[PDB]
């Protein structure tokens, strides 16, 4: 997310045993990175 020119990144990792869908159970994402970049964002694209 973007707030006041900060770009904020949160993350989590877990094992999974259903291939089809995201897990029905609950887990929460701790912060990892926070960048003071001051940039307009309206599009994104992943990289493989």
């Amino acid at each position: 997310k973007n707030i006041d020119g900060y770009f904020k990144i949160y993350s989590k990792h877990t094992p999974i045993n259903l291939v089809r869908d995201l897990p029905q159970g609950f887990s929460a994402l701790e912060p990892l990175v926070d960048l003071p970049i001051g940039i307009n964002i309206t599009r994104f694209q992943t990289l493989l």
């Binding site: 006041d4 020119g5 001051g38 940039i39 307009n40």
Partner: peptide, 24 residues
């Protein structure tokens, strides 16, 4: 502070066009 001894000549290079956003 006034930088009148450093940045004056005149000097025409110094340019003007949400918080902390750089509109380049």
């Amino acid at each position: 502070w006034n930088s009148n001894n450093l940045d004056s000549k005149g000097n025409y290079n110094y340019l003007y066009r949400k918080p902390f956003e750089r509109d380049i």
